[PDB]
Design a protein around this ligand. Structure first.
Ligand SMILES: CCCCCCCCCCCCCCCCCC(=O)OC[C@H](CO[C@@H]1O[C@H](CO[C@H]2O[C@H](CO)[C@H](O)[C@H](O)[C@H]2O)[C@H](O)[C@H](O)[C@H]1O)OC(=O)CCCCCCCCCCCCCCCCC
Ligand SMILES: CCCCCCCCCCCCCCCCCC(=O)OC[C@H](CO[C@@H]1O[C@H](CO[C@H]2O[C@H](CO)[C@H](O)[C@H](O)[C@H]2O)[C@H](O)[C@H](O)[C@H]1O)OC(=O)CCCCCCCCCCCCCCCCC
Ligand SMILES: CCCCCCCCCCCCCCCC(=O)OC[C@H](CO[C@@H]1O[C@H](CS(=O)(=O)O)[C@@H](O)[C@H](O)[C@H]1O)OC(=O)CCCCCCCCCCCCCCC
Ligand SMILES: CCCCCCCCCCCCCCCC(=O)OC[C@H](COP(=O)(O)OC[C@@H](O)CO)OC(=O)CCCCCCCCCCCCCCC
Ligand SMILES: CCCCCCCCCCCCCCCC(=O)OC[C@H](COP(=O)(O)OC[C@@H](O)CO)OC(=O)CCCCCCCCCCCCCCC
Ligand SMILES: CC1=C(/C=C/C(C)=C/C=C/C(C)=C/C=C/C=C(C)/C=C/C=C(C)/C=C/C2=C(C)CCCC2(C)C)C(C)(C)CCC1
Ligand code: SF4
Lengths: 200, 121, 73, 47, 148, 110, 101, 365
């Protein structure tokens, strides 16, 4: 074939619909409600922008702890594979017009934990579709604002007639297995344990 | 009989206008949806994991006791309304009997305050 | 000429003053001072933004507030 | 029994004075100018 | 606001390369980038600081060296030209292509004339370069920016 | 306990989709291939992926139901998807909102 | 608008409250139909004070007293009900067959 | 002057039947008050954001308009465009109509607040009843949305918020009763007329100083300013389950309740449409003021301006005292409420009745 990994190949509009699309894009550009998710010092670098020195609030972004009223998630920090289904569920529980900004060197790629590591996830793009990458270990908060500016330049590229892309197809398949039933995992049972007070 | 009062068409019209708008806003939000509803994988809100504990609430009494003292004092406030309305030419015996009423309900409040009738420990 | 025409003229002049000539000087003075004003003057500026808000809703997307470039040698 | 009532009244007037002092320092904090910078209009100088 | 019409498309079809001045506080070139797709042009986002050489990446093939950690040996990846392979399996209607550079501030004026000659050699793709801008949205010819 | 392991393309759920939700059941494993618009698919390569999934679920027999073995099955499935992409088959599509090459870049053989 | 339709509506609400007092499939719906049974007589007293009475109104006073009485009876009935869930495990009325002859 | 009488006379000169002509006159002010209420909500959101920025020494939302005033409008226009998500449960119509049951009566209670002698909707007898009994409905919608929420923590947070909301209804009624005893009436027109008879010396803030503080504390506890019930036992009390539309409805409903409380506190205690100098002396000093509307229009504008500066002052004081006093627990809040606002409110009503029965000269008689 001589070409590895090939790419498959894939008009008059109105002025009032164009102005309505400009208003619809300007509303998403003006609100831009983020989500604060951080497990390391990148969360401290994000919280340094919320303080009254860089004024991250002035672009319209307000801090929310809810992964349901945020049209943008900001993953940050060294990601363990035990936290990867947690991040997948936190991304899936968000509404459909969502965006991903990945901040950090260990987030967008393996980072420093890419030579001798067995638990760190080498890249968040294997988990969630990253729109704007952000290299840096740790990046400047001005670079985070530059990534916000590039995300705002990327949001206005969307269309109101080509809105039929924010969905997931079914492609269901049903098969059986022959695995053995597992005993359950511990839920509590730390202080009032029969092997704790009574010495064996 | 005849229906003569100060007026009630404003209340009904404002109720109709204020009740027509939320379902209209919901219909507009359903019309200007990006694609549709009917999410393929429906999951409830847990913070970071799967539900491992249980869907049961501990049997408490603090909400029912608060609503009990609330309805007991609300039907007192309802009886306390027309005495304060009609206190323009009535007199002093009504004030004495309302003072007896207020003192009896204050004794009721002291009985509810002394024992464990409301305590969110 | 009658008194009702004078009342209509007073109403039109009041609507014009409420919509055009007050938010222009409000938008001028608000970013003209913006730092030297005290807390009472800041409350007065916030009240001036609060009161004539239908004028601000019509004069908001037309005006532009951006810093001017400087010269270099 | 009355000394507990006077101590509660002293704690209440002390809490009211603390609320008034908090309102005073909050009104004091409105006098100073904001110390933030604009981006990309006021960029910092790299050392 | 400002109800913009269809004027950037005519200026892009008349010349071969354009330079627009946008405010860097937010995003306003997305409206023209969406109007280009509404007119029937396929957009291609690309970053101007990381490009290497323009000739070896746009006309011929290049060799990328991935960062190895000593575990693997020294390998080379043969990268084809980007706009050529984007022009190969392009056309649904066969109207035109555009190339958008985001941060055009970190570039020299030597390769700009070569890019303006390359977009005039093959009449199938356009070149759109972004400058940090001064307080207003204005368009300028890139050849006039090179000559002056 | 809802056992699952998904990264971007494979979804191995240890339940059964009735209408739009799942229930905990250790007798049925549901497979979802490429839920996001990242690769365009067909009916023959998807059938080969399903046959490889049936072979991998027939290989794992006599083991306990844990997250490690299910994640290993999903990793072998994604390795089969990557080798099918490298074999000279279907790849990326130019119709999504974001274009990120997560598996590889198009290169030249010679 | 006549008094006869209001009396017919009050009688129909009284019969609905009687049926929801008898069957009810529960023990809280018994009290919920008791409130309907007293709201029917509240409608009866309000219509009687509207049509038959003139200046000196007293059926409205009786309706306010009946409303306060029914609120106290609802509080007493819920205090009775909330001990059964503490004592017994079930809430069905048909299981209470201990006190026989 | 009378715009309604002139409109009726013009429709009679055009030729109509005096019933359908008078039927359709009411929806134009009935929608005008609603659109100026949404205008005041968009004012109050920007005001709260910029004042919270100015307290913590920073700047609010910018780069959206001239100074970011379109940002509440942009938020309200964006939050209705989001995808309405639903959890894995039943009763979708109940989950939809729960916030509707919350939003209906607080919006409905706009027929009570006045702006002058003629600039109001309804003043029949008992507007304080139509405020209290309609504001006491929202716990039902809160418990309905908590039951349709299908969660262990959000339902408990909704139960805690409902128990917090229903406890502050009784001193909120007793502080209204303490003013309605002195005013010998339940309508707001007689209450504001007894204050606008004289100037500063007839205000109810100097006559009932404890009841004003009790009413203000009860309003700050009811509109959820000091009680943070939106860290609420896992993350939040009645949140983390809706979409942008229901959250926008709850946000606008909370701001409507805040605006309505900030208007009603000033109306019942301080008094909008009032001046320190009485209007009769100014009318006697200027000329003849009985039919000439050139000064009456300016007096109505001045009364609207006085009501607006009183509402803005109360809004600024509430959102300044939000971040001034620290956060207290909901148990300590219920304890301080039930141990302070009820006994001092009862003895305040008792001393009010005693002062009314002792010297009925300066009170309502
Ligand atoms: C921090 C928070 C910030 C808050 C926000 C601040 C920013 C926003 C501030 C804006 C101001 C707030 C709103 C003002 C107060 C509300 C006034 C209102 O609702 O007020 C309601 C008013 C009605 O109020 C008064 O209503 C009167 C009728 O009252 C009657 O009806 C009333 C019930 O409506 C009462 O019951 C009253 O007792 C009873 O007498 C008359 O109509 C008065 O003129 C009128 O002032 O609605 C109207 O203004 C009428 C509606 C428009 C109709 C158009 C007029 C019709 C066209 C006539 C054209 C005539 C053409 C022929 C000319 C002849 C040529 C020869
Ligand atoms: C591109 C889009 C264009 C949009 C076009 C829309 C244009 C039309 C809308 C423009 C509105 C703004 C123009 C201002 C009109 C104000 C007229 C006014 O107040 O008219 C006054 C009349 C007076 O009403 C009459 O007033 C009489 C005299 O009473 C007055 O005087 C008495 C004195 O004791 C009492 O105090 C009494 O309470 C008080 O109302 C009686 O009350 C009568 O019942 C009543 O008919 O009100 C009336 O009819 C009711 C009038 C309702 C107006 C409410 C609007 C809020 C007022 C604007 C805010 C003030 C801003 C002023 C800015 C100036 C800054 C320096
Ligand atoms: C013949 C005259 C006709 C006048 C028509 C007036 C129409 C007014 C509304 C404008 C509508 C079109 C806006 C296009 C958006 C855009 O691209 O950005 C235009 C500007 C960009 O900034 C602005 O941009 C300008 C230029 S630039 O982009 O910065 O370079 C700059 O000058 C300015 O400072 C800056 O603010 O954004 C805005 O701030 C304008 C906000 C307009 C939004 C109005 C809200 C509508 C509410 C009603 C909704 C009804 C539908 C309800 C659905 C349920
Ligand atoms: C933007 C457009 C939106 C649409 C416009 C809205 C139209 C709405 C009103 C129509 C205008 C014409 C009719 C009004 C004009 C009109 O004709 O009314 C006038 C009419 C009688 O008024 P008067 O007695 O003043 O009029 C006659 C006098 O002039 C002399 O006798 O008023 C009533 O009948 C009041 C009715 C209230 C009835 C009691 C209230 C019932 C409330 C029930 C609450 C239920 C809660 C249920 C919960 C489940
Ligand atoms: C011009 C109008 C100015 C009006 C401003 C008044 C609004 C302020 C209301 C306070 C809201 C917050 C309540 C939280 C209060 C709070 O959280 O702490 C309340 C605090 C509780 O203390 P503890 O928890 O120790 O008490 C309970 C324990 O003792 C259990 O045993 O004490 C009170 O009970 C006393 C209340 C006095 C409250 C005084 C309030 C008024 C202070 C300002 C007086 C101004 C005079 C101005 C003169 C110009
Ligand atoms: C004639 C007229 C006019 C005028 C106006 C005016 C003149 C106004 C002003 C006024 C004002 C300007 C007001 C405001 C105010 C506000 C404020 C200022 C508030 C705040 C404060 C606070 C809340 C505080 C507190 C406290 C306390 C209580 C204690 C002690 C301490 C303190 C003091 C901190 C106009 C042009 C409009 C038009 C129409 C007509
Ligand atoms: S990129 Fe650097 S700063 Fe960020 S999480 Fe990794 S080690 Fe920490």
């Amino acid at each position: 074939p001589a070409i590895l990994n090939p790419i498959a190949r894939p008009l008059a509009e109105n002025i009032i619909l164009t102005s309505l699309n400009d208003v619809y894009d300007w509303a998403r550009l003006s609100s831009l409600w983020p989500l604060m998710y951080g497990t390391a010092c990148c969360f401290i670098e994000f919280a340094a922008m919320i303080g009254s020195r860089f004024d991250f609030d002035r672009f319209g972004l307000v801090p929310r702890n809810s992964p349901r009223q945020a049209d943008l998630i900001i993953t940050s920090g060294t990601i363990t594979m035990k936290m990867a289904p947690a991040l997948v569920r936190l991304y899936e529980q968000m509404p459909s017009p969502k965006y991903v900004i990945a901040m950090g060197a260990c987030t967008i790629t393996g980072g420093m934990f890419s030579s001798d590591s067995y638990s760190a996830v080498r890249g968040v793009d294997k988990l969630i579709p990253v729109d704007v990458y952000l290299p840096g270990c740790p990046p400047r908060p001005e670079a985070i604002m530059d990534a916000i500016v590039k995300l705002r330049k990327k949001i206005a590229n969307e269309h109101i007639n080509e809105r039929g892309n924010l969905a997931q197809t079914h492609r269901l398949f049903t098969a059986k297995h022959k695995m053995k039933p597992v005993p359950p995992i511990l839920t509590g049972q730390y202080l009032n344990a029969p092997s704790r007070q009574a010495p064996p | 009989t005849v229906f003569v009062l100060s007026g009630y068409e404003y209340f009904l019209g404002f109720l109709i206008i204020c009740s027509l708008v939320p379902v209209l806003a919901l219909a507009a939000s359903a019309l200007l949806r990006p694609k549709s509803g009917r999410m393929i994988r429906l999951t409830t809100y847990e913070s970071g994991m799967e539900p491992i504990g249980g869907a049961w609430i501990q049997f408490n009494v603090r909400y029912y006791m608060f609503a009990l003292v609330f309805v007991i004092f609300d039907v007192e406030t309802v009886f306390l309304y027309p005495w304060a309305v009609a206190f323009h030419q009535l007199g002093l015996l009504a004030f004495i009997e309302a003072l007896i009423f207020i003192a009896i309900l204050v004794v009721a409040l002291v009985y509810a305050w002394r024992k464990r009738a409301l305590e969110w420990s | 000429v009658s008194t009702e025409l004078l009342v209509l003229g007073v109403y039109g002049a009041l609507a014009g003053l409420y919509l055009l000539v007050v938010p222009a000087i409000v938008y001028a003075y608000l970013n003209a001072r913006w730092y030297v004003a005290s807390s009472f003057e800041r409350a007065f500026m916030y009240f001036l933004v609060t009161f004539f808000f239908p004028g601000l809703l019509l004069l908001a997307p037309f005006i532009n507030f951006r810093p001017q470039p400087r010269s270099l040698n | 029994f009355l000394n507990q009532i006077t101590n509660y009244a002293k704690e209440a007037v002390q809490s009211a004075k603390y609320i008034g002092q908090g309102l005073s320092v909050t009104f004091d904090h409105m006098r100073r100018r904001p110390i933030t910078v604009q981006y990309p209009y006021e960029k910092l100088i790299p050392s | 606001g400002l109800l913009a019409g269809y004027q950037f498309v005519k200026d892009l079809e008349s010349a071969g390369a354009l330079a627009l001045f946008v405010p860097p506080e937010g995003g306003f070139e997305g409206r023209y980038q969406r109007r280009l797709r509404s007119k029937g042009y396929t957009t291609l986002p690309m970053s101007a600081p990381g490009l290497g050489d323009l000739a070896a990446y746009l006309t011929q093939e290049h060799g990328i060296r991935p960062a190895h950690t000593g575990k693997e040996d020294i390998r080379v990846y043969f990268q084809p030209p980007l706009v050529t392979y984007h022009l190969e399996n392009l056309p649904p209607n066969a109207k035109g292509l555009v190339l958008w550079l985001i941060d055009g501030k970190r570039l020299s004026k030597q390769e700009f004339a070569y890019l303006a000659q390359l977009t005039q050699t093959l009449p199938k793709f356009k070149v759109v370069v972004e400058v940090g801008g001064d307080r207003v949205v204005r368009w300028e010819p890139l050849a006039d920016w090179v000559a002056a | 306990m809802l056992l699952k392991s998904t990264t971007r393309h494979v979804h191995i759920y240890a339940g059964h989709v009735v209408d739009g939700e799942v229930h905990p059941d250790t007798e049925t494993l549901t497979l979802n291939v490429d839920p996001d618009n990242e690769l365009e698919w067909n009916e023959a390569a998807l059938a080969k992926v399903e046959a490889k999934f049936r072979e991998l679920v027939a290989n794992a027999a006599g083991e306990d139901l844990t997250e490690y073995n299910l994640r290993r099955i999903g990793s072998d499935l994604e390795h089969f998807i990557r080798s099918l992409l490298m074999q000279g088959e279907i790849g990326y599509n130019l119709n999504s909102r974001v274009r990120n090459y997560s598996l590889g870049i198009p290169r030249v053989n010679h | 608008m006549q008094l006869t339709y209001v009396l017919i509506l009050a009688a129909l609400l009284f019969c609905i409250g009687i049926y929801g007092l008898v069957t009810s499939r529960n023990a809280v719906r018994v009290l919920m139909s008791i409130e309907l049974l007293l709201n029917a007589v509240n409608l009866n007293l309000i219509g009687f004070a509207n049509y038959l009475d003139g200046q000196q109104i007293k059926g409205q006073v009786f309706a306010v007293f009946v409303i306060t009485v029914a609120a106290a009876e609802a509080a007493v009935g819920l205090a009775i009900i909330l001990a059964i869930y503490r004592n017994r495990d079930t809430v069905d009325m048909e299981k209470f067959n201990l006190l026989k002859w | 002057i009378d715009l309604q009488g002139q409109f009726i006379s013009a429709l009679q000169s055009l030729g109509l039947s005096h019933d359908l002509a008078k039927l359709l006159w009411l929806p134009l002010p009935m929608l005008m008050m609603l659109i100026v209420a949404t205008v005041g909500v968009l004012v109050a959101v920007w005001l709260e954001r910029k004042i919270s920025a100015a307290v913590q020494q920073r700047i609010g939302p910018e780069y959206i308009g001239p100074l970011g005033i379109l940002a509440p409008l942009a938020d309200g226009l964006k939050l209705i465009f989001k995808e309405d998500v639903l959890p894995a449960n039943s009763d979708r119509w109940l989950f939809t109509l729960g916030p509707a049951v919350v939003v209906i009566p607080v919006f409905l209670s706009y027929i009570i607040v006045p702006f002058g002698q003629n600039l109001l909707i309804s003043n029949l007898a008992m507007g304080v009843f139509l405020w209290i009994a309609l504001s006491s409905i929202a716990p039902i919608g809160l418990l309905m949305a908590g039951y349709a929420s299908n969660n262990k923590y959000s339902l408990l947070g909704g139960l805690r918020a409902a128990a917090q909301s229903i406890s502050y209804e009784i001193p909120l009624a007793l502080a209204v009763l303490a003013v309605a005893m002195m005013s010998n009436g339940l309508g707001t027109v007689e209450i504001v007329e007894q204050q606008s008879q004289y100037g500063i010396l007839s205000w109810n803030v100097w006559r009932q100083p404890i009841g004003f503080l009790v009413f203000w504390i009860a309003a700050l506890a009811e509109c959820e300013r000091l009680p943070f019930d939106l860290e609420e036992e896992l993350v939040a009390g009645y949140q983390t389950e809706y979409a942008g539309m229901k959250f926008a409805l709850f946000y606008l409903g909370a701001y409507v309740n805040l605006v309505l409380s900030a208007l009603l506190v000033s109306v019942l205690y301080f008094g909008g449409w009032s001046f320190p100098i009485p209007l009769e002396t100014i009318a006697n000093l200027l000329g003849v003021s009985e039919t000439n509307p050139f000064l009456q229009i300016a007096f109505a504008v001045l009364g609207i301006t006085m009501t607006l500066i009183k509402a803005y002052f109360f809004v600024f004081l509430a959102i300044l005292l939000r971040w001034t006093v620290p956060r207290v627990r909901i148990d300590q809040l219920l304890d301080l409420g039930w141990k302070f606002l009820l006994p001092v409110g009862l003895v305040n009503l008792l001393l009010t009745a005693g002062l009314k029965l002792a010297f009925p000269v300066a009170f309502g008689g």
